Nucleic acid binder design. Sequence first.
RNA 1: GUGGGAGAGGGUGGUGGAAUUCCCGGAGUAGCGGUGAAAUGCGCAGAUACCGGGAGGAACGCCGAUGGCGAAGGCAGCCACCUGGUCCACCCGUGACGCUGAGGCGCGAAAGCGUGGGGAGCAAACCGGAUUAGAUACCCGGGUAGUCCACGCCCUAAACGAUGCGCGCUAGGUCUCUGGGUCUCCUGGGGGCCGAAGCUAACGCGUUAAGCGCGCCGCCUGGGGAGUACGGCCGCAAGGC
Lengths: 73, 155, 119
Amino acid sequence: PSRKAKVKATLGEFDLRDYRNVEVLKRFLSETGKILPRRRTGLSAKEQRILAKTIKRARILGLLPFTEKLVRK
Amino acid sequence: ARRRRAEVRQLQPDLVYGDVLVTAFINKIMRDGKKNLAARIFYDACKIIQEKTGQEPLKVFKQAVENVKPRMEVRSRRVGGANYQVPMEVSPRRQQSLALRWLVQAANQRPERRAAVRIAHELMDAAEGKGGAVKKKEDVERMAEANRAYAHYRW
Amino acid sequence: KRQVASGRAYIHASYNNTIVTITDPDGNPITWSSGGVIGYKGSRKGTPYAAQLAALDAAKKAMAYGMQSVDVIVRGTGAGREQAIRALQASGLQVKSIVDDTPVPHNGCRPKKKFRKAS
RNA sequence: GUGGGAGAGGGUGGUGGAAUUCCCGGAGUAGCGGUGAAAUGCGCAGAUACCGGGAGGAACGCCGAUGGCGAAGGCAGCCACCUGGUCCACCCGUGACGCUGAGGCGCGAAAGCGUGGGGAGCAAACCGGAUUAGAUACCCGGGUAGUCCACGCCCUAAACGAUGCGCGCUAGGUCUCUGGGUCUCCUGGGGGCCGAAGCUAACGCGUUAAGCGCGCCGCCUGGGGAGUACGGCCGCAAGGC
Ligand SMILES: [K+]
Ligand SMILES: [K+]
Ligand SMILES: [K+]
Ligand SMILES: [Mg+2]
Ligand SMILES: [Mg+2]
Ligand SMILES: [Mg+2]
Ligand SMILES: [Mg+2]
Ligand SMILES: [Mg+2]
Ligand SMILES: [Mg+2]
Ligand SMILES: [Mg+2]
Ligand SMILES: [Mg+2]
Ligand SMILES: [Mg+2]
Ligand SMILES: [Mg+2]
Ligand SMILES: [Mg+2]
Ligand SMILES: [Mg+2]
Ligand SMILES: [Mg+2]
Ligand SMILES: [Mg+2]
Ligand SMILES: [Mg+2]
Ligand SMILES: [Mg+2]
Ligand SMILES: [Mg+2]
Ligand SMILES: [Mg+2]
Ligand SMILES: [Mg+2]
Ligand SMILES: [Mg+2]
Ligand SMILES: [Mg+2]
Ligand SMILES: [Mg+2]
Ligand SMILES: [Mg+2]
Ligand SMILES: [Mg+2]
Ligand SMILES: [Mg+2]
Ligand SMILES: [Mg+2]
Ligand SMILES: [Mg+2]
Ligand SMILES: [Mg+2]
Ligand SMILES: [Mg+2]
Ligand SMILES: [Mg+2]
Ligand SMILES: [Mg+2]
Ligand SMILES: [Mg+2]
Ligand SMILES: [Mg+2]
Ligand SMILES: [Mg+2]
Ligand SMILES: [Mg+2]
Ligand SMILES: [Mg+2]
Ligand SMILES: [Mg+2]
Ligand SMILES: [Mg+2]
Ligand SMILES: [Mg+2]
Ligand SMILES: [Mg+2]
Ligand SMILES: [Mg+2]
Ligand SMILES: [Mg+2]
Ligand SMILES: [Mg+2]
Ligand SMILES: [Mg+2]
Ligand SMILES: [Mg+2]
Ligand SMILES: [Mg+2]
Ligand SMILES: [Mg+2]
């Protein structure tokens, strides 16, 4: 049910369209480079939709990863 | 036993050594419901244990039974259409049952003339670690653990 | 005879076989094993026990090169992955980190009919 | 009209990473693969597994959904350009300019055809291995057209909501997408579920009507024969109407 914490509620004021802000978009990825779902981020439909494209831009720029590796399995 | 769990029968203790295990071995010796003949056989075998071994026949008996008990057996299982020899542990009751059955069955395979001599010789050889019953234990513990590759079919 | 003393351990676990390749920290292999290097020939290689034997054999081969610590890398979903993990874990070889690095595509190629109803 | 909004709507160019295959190098050894179990197959000309580099073709993981867009077919990495539809608010302008629509015209998944190109993965036909009483199959190893691109054809479908389009009228509750607003909520557009009245042979429909009405188009008239025959039109052909 993802009762640990919401990424939005664990954050303050930030721009959802800034593809260069890496340290804030890192929070929206999982342990792997995958994009977190709605239940983890706590965003709205429009917010998540914008976040997806901004994350893809940050990936293409070389700032965010396309995929990572899992540890401690 | 589908509905219930089939609680184990409690046997009467022995009239000589007071052990229920001796009574179970008597019963496995018994044939056609001849209890007195089985008791004659076993107690004459015990009198053979002494004058051949200074140890009390009860200790030799229990040590042989312990030496025959198998630790793992192998049961068949139908998986994916085929039949496999899956290894699995043995409950203590089945250990005792198989031990006594193998003791009697291997004793009657001996070339000895009368039954008491067969049972006495089988008990002595099984106590010191040989005989047909220990061969059966080794064969079962070989079949099991010879098919370790099926251990995940334990169920 | 190189005396590496520390390297990586790749585990390729498929539904048909599990194969272990022990390499140096740069990925160059040293020794390896599989279900076929053990006596198992047919489907018995896709067994967790076969994977355990393969892992232990590869570990003992790496002992000849005097290796002590490894970094484990898992690839593929197959029965016997965790058994090979637990075999390497307590084998004298110190397991430093276990990492799953299964190659998943981004929907690039078309699978065989066996893996269809997906993309 | 003005001012805003959301969107995989379409076209063109460019561009990114994961993966498959192949090639080069390193390292390394006896099998890999595959199945219910196997065999064909590939491997001492060094495979599989591992690391690095390179080439190429195709499809875009997470986001992603019961979601969005489109007239339908259908549309999913990213960027730019060109471009279509649509919704809301203001109550500004025209002043019935409307609805439908036989023909006509255009679009129309997949497969298929022509010319040229491309060809990694998959894969009809086919070559084998199994299975089987046989196995022109399912299972396994290969594999051509094809799948891809440009241009031109082809006009089919469970082209489906099996429900033509438009307008008006007739309880609500709940979930959701997208605006506007006095932003607990109200109001408008769209996507779902449950249900008033009513309808239905029933299942079910129920402000997204299959309810109540009106307008216009399409189509049905027992089953097989048969979407066959003939004729016509269209098509290079397959064939379609
Ligand atoms: K939809
Ligand atoms: K050709
Ligand atoms: K609002
Ligand atoms: Mg016997
Ligand atoms: Mg196998
Ligand atoms: Mg678009
Ligand atoms: Mg090579
Ligand atoms: Mg092959
Ligand atoms: Mg080949
Ligand atoms: Mg050969
Ligand atoms: Mg040679
Ligand atoms: Mg390869
Ligand atoms: Mg490579
Ligand atoms: Mg090529
Ligand atoms: Mg999805
Ligand atoms: Mg729509
Ligand atoms: Mg459709
Ligand atoms: Mg006015
Ligand atoms: Mg006027
Ligand atoms: Mg019209
Ligand atoms: Mg028309
Ligand atoms: Mg078409
Ligand atoms: Mg086509
Ligand atoms: Mg063609
Ligand atoms: Mg061609
Ligand atoms: Mg193929
Ligand atoms: Mg095939
Ligand atoms: Mg065949
Ligand atoms: Mg048959
Ligand atoms: Mg035959
Ligand atoms: Mg080829
Ligand atoms: Mg051709
Ligand atoms: Mg449908
Ligand atoms: Mg229809
Ligand atoms: Mg009908
Ligand atoms: Mg309707
Ligand atoms: Mg509505
Ligand atoms: Mg209903
Ligand atoms: Mg009613
Ligand atoms: Mg009813
Ligand atoms: Mg209506
Ligand atoms: Mg008819
Ligand atoms: Mg008729
Ligand atoms: Mg008909
Ligand atoms: Mg027809
Ligand atoms: Mg016809
Ligand atoms: Mg005709
Ligand atoms: Mg003609
Ligand atoms: Mg034909
Ligand atoms: Mg034909």
